Design an enzyme around this catalytic site. Structure first.
Site, PDB file in Angstrom:
ATOM      1  CD  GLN A 229      -2.441   1.930   0.490  1.00  0.00           C
ATOM      2  OE1 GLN A 229      -3.114   1.176  -0.208  1.00  0.00           O
ATOM      3  NE2 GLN A 229      -2.471   3.249   0.344  1.00  0.00           N
ATOM      4  CD  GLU A 230       2.406   3.585   3.935  1.00  0.00           C
ATOM      5  OE1 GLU A 230       2.518   4.552   3.149  1.00  0.00           O
ATOM      6  OE2 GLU A 230       1.836   3.686   5.048  1.00  0.00           O
ATOM      7  CB  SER A 231       6.636   1.642  -1.441  1.00  0.00           C
ATOM      8  OG  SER A 231       6.644   0.230  -1.285  1.00  0.00           O
TER       9      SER A 231
ATOM     10  CE1 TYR B  48      -2.287   2.116   6.387  1.00  0.00           C
ATOM     11  CE2 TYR B  48      -1.285   3.217   4.493  1.00  0.00           C
ATOM     12  CZ  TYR B  48      -1.164   2.437   5.636  1.00  0.00           C
ATOM     13  OH  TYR B  48       0.065   2.003   6.060  1.00  0.00           O
TER      14      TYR B  48
END
Length: 618
Positions: free
Chosen positions: A477-479, A587
Site C-alpha cells: 500500500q505504501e510504496s 488506507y
C-alpha cells in the site's frame, strides 16, 4: 567486450565522474558506446556544460533518443536555458512547437512576443494565467508585457483573483489585488483584507456591491471562518444572505459549509438539530455520506436508516452503501433481499465483497486472470527494455520507473499484461505493479500482489506478532514495492517511513546501525525499522489490524480519539467506514484487502478479519 564487462566500466566511469577525474572519464566514454545506458552518460556530459552548448548538439541528442526520459525533459530544460541567454529567436528555432513544462511554455510565449508574434503570445499567456495556482517565475515577464499591451481583458484579471481565492492561494489574491486594474480598484483593499483575514467577510459583503464575483469570494472566506469557529459561521448566515441578497442555492451552500463543521462529538443539541435540518435540505452527496458515517460511527440504527435513504440513487450504487442497505435489511428480517445484495457484492473485487462473504459465512472467491503464456514480444527484446534491465540491475528504481512508463504507455491490454508478467518473472516487483496499473489489469492479482522481499519480511516478522502477510500488505500500500520512492514530505522507501518515526523507533526498540534517513532507501533497513514500528502500534492496540493500520497512517493519537468517539457501540465494519479521514479510511480498506491477497498467495485462507477483530466491540 561483453555486457558484464561494460557493467564494471559503467560503475567505474560514474565513480570517476563523481570525483571530477575527467581525464579518466574522457578516456572511458568512447568504450561504453555499446552499453545500454550510454545515452545517460551523454546526457550527463551535455548537461554538465549546458550554458555553453550549441542548440544543434541538443537537437541531435533529443532526435537520436526518442524514448529516453531525460532526452524528453531536456527539450524543456534547454528551452529554459535559451531563455536565460535571452536567445528568443534561438528558442523558437529549437522548439517551434509549445514545449512540455509550464516554465518552458512561459518562456516559449515570451519568445513569441519578442519575435513579433504578439497575438499568439497573448493566447498562450491567457491560458497560463487562468489558474489559481502560483505559476513559474518565468511567466512574470510574460504576464507583464501581456498587460502592458492593452490586450489583457480586465475580466480575465478578476477571474484569476476568484480562482486564486478558491484555491486557498490568498498570497496570490493579495498580490493581484495590490496591482488591481483601475476598473476594480474600488474593491481592491476589501479583497486584500478578505485574503488577510476571512473574518472580515461580513464587512466585505456589506461594503461591496453584491455580484457573482463578490458572492463567490465571500463564500470561500465564509468556509475559512467556519473551519475556525463553526458557531460564529452558523450565526452569520442570515446577515450574509441579506447583505448579498443570496438566492436559495447560495444560502444552501452556506448551510452545507457549516454542517460539515458540526460533525464533531462536541456539538450541542441546538447545533445538531440545525445541522440535520441543513443536511435534509442539501443536494450535496458527500455531505449526506458524511452524515451516514456519523450514524455508523455512533451505532445509530434509526439514523442509518434515515440518512442512507437520503442519498441520491447514484450514490446508493457504491459498494459501501449496498452493504449497509443489506445490514439494515438483515436486522429488519428481510433475509432473502439482504443476502441477494451480499451475494452480488461477493462477485466483485475488494474490501466490501470480502466483508460480504465473511458476513454470510461463505468463502470469498478470488478472481485471478492470468497473463499470456508467452510474454516475449518485440517490446521485451528492444533497446528500451535493455535500458530497463540495466537500471534495475543498479537498483535505480526511480529511473527505471520513467523508462517503464514509456514502455507500457499506449500499448494493448495484452501487451501490458505480458510486460507485467515479464517484470514479475524478473522479480522487478515495482515494475510488475506499475504495468498492472497502466493496463488497469485489476483482476491480474498475482502480478498486482507479488511476494516481494519475501525472505526479508519473513526474517523481520519471525520474532514479532504482526503476520508476515500483514507487513507485506502495508508495504504494498505504501510504496507499490518501489524501495527508492520518497513522498513530497519525506516519507521513504518500502514502508514510507518518516525520518522522525525512524529516529523514534530506533530509540524505542534499541535498534543498532541507523544514522541517516538516506538508509531508509535500503530494503532491509526499511523493513527492519518499518516492521518494528508496525509491531509497536500492533501490540499497543491489542493485535488488531484495523487499529494498527489506522495508527500507521494517522498516528496512535487519532486512533485513540476515534475509539473514544465510537466508545464500544459499533462493529468492525462500521468502525472502518466511519473513520473521519477519507485517506485513512481508504488506507485501512486497502490494507485489509491486500493482506487477504497476500495470505492467498502464501497458501493460507484469505478470510478478511480474524474472529477477534470481527467480533470485538468498537
Amino acid at each position: 567486450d561483453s555486457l558484464d564487462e561494460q557493467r564494471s566500466r559503467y560503475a567505474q566511469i560514474k565513480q570517476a565522474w563523481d570525483n571530477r577525474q575527467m581525464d579518466v572519464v574522457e578516456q572511458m566514454m568512447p568504450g561504453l558506446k555499446d552499453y545500454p545506458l550510454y545515452p545517460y552518460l551523454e546526457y550527463r556530459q551535455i548537461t554538465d556544460d549546458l550554458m555553453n552548448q550549441p542548440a544543434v548538439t541538443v537537437t541531435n541528442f533529443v532526435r537520436a533518443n526518442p524514448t529516453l526520459p531525460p532526452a524528453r525533459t531536456l527539450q524543456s530544460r534547454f528551452v529554459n536555458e535559451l531563455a536565460r541567454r535571452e536567445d528568443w529567436r534561438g528558442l523558437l528555432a529549437f522548439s517551434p512547437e509549445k514545449p512540455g513544462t509550464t516554465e518552458a511554455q512561459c518562456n516559449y510565449y515570451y519568445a513569441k512576443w519578442n519575435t513579433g508574434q504578439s497575438e499568439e503570445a497573448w493566447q498562450g499567456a491567457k491560458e497560463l494565467w487562468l489558474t489559481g495556482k502560483s505559476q513559474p517565475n518565468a511567466c512574470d515577464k510574460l504576464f507583464s508585457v501581456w498587460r502592458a499591451s492593452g490586450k489583457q481583458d480586465p475580466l480575465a484579471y478578476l477571474e484569476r483573483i476568484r480562482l486564486a481565492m478558491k484555491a486557498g492561494n490568498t498570497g496570490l489574491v493579495t498580490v493581484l489585488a495590490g496591482q488591481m486594474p483601475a476598473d476594480y480598484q474600488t474593491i481592491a483593499s476589501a479583497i486584500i483584507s478578505l485574503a488577510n483575514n476571512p473574518n472580515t467577510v461580513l464587512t466585505f459583503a456589506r461594503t461591496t456591491g453584491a455580484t457573482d464575483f463578490t458572492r463567490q469570494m465571500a463564500a470561500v472566506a465564509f468556509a475559512s471562518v467556519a473551519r475556525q469557529d463553526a458557531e460564529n459561521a452558523r450565526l452569520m448566515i442570515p446577515s450574509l444572505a441579506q447583505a448579498q441578497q443570496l438566492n436559495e442555492d447560495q444560502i444552501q451552500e452556506l448551510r452545507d459549509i457549516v454542517a460539515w463543521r458540526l460533525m464533531g462529538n462536541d456539538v450541542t443539541d441546538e447545533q445538531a438539530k440545525w445541522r440535520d435540518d441543513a443536511i435534509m435540505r442539501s443536494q450535496s452527496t458527500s455531505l449526506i455520506e458524511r452524515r451516514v458515517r456519523m450514524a455508523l460511527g455512533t451505532g445509530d440504527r434509526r439514523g442509518l436508516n434515515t440518512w442512507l435513504a437520503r442519498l441520491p440513487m447514484e450514490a446508493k450504487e457504491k459498494d459501501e452503501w449496498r452493504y449497509w442497505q443489506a445490514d439494515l435489511l438483515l436486522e429488519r428480517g428481510r433475509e432473502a433481499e439482504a443476502k441477494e445484495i451480499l451475494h452480488q457484492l461477493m462477485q466483485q473485487r475488494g474490501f466490501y465483497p470480502m466483508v460480504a462473504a465473511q458476513r454470510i459465512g461463505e468463502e470469498y472467491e478470488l478472481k485471478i486472470d492470468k497473463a499470456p503464456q508467452n510474454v516475449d514480444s518485440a517490446l521485451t527484446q528492444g533497446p528500451e527494455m535493455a535500458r530497463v534491465r540495466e537500471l534495475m540491475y543498479w537498483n535505480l528504481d526511480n529511473t527505471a520507473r520513467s523508462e517503464w512508463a514509456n514502455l507500457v504507455k499506449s500499448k494493448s491490454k495484452t501487451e501490458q499484461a505480458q510486460l507485467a508478467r515479464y517484470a514479475f518473472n524478473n522479480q522487478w516487483w515495482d515494475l510488475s505493479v506499475q504495468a498492472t496499473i497502466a493496463g488497469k489489469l485489476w483482476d491480474h492479482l498475482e502480478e498486482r500482489f507479488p511476494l516481494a522481499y519475501n525472505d526479508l519480511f519473513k526474517r523481520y516478522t519471525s520474532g514479532k506478532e504482526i503476520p508476515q502477510s500483514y507487513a507485506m500488505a502495508i508495504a504494498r500500500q505504501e510504496s507499490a514495492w518501489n524501495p527508492k520512492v520518497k513522498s513530497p514530505v519525506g516519507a521513504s522507501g518500502l514502508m514510507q517511513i518518516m525520518p522522525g518515526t525512524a529516529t523514534h523507533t530506533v530509540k524505542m526498540f534499541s535498534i543498532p546501525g541507523y544514522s541517516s534517513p538516506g538508509q531508509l532507501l535500503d530494503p532491509e533497513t526499511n523493513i527492519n525499522i518499518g516492521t518494528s514500528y508496525l509491531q509497536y502500534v500492533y501490540q499497543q492496540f491489542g493485535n488488531n489490524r484495523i487499529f494498527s493500520s489506522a495508527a500507521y497512517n494517522a498516528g496512535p493519537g487519532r486512533v485513540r480519539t476515534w475509539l473514544g468517539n465510537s466508545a464500544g457501540r459499533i462493529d468492525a465494519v462500521a468502525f472502518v467506514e466511519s473513520i473521519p479521514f477519507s485517506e485513512t479510511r481508504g488506507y485501512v480498506k486497502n490494507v485489509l484487502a491486500y493482506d487477504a491477497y497476500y495470505r492467498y498467495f502464501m497458501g493460507d485462507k484469505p478470510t478478511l478479519m480474524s474472529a477477534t477483530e470481527w467480533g470485538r466491540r468498537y
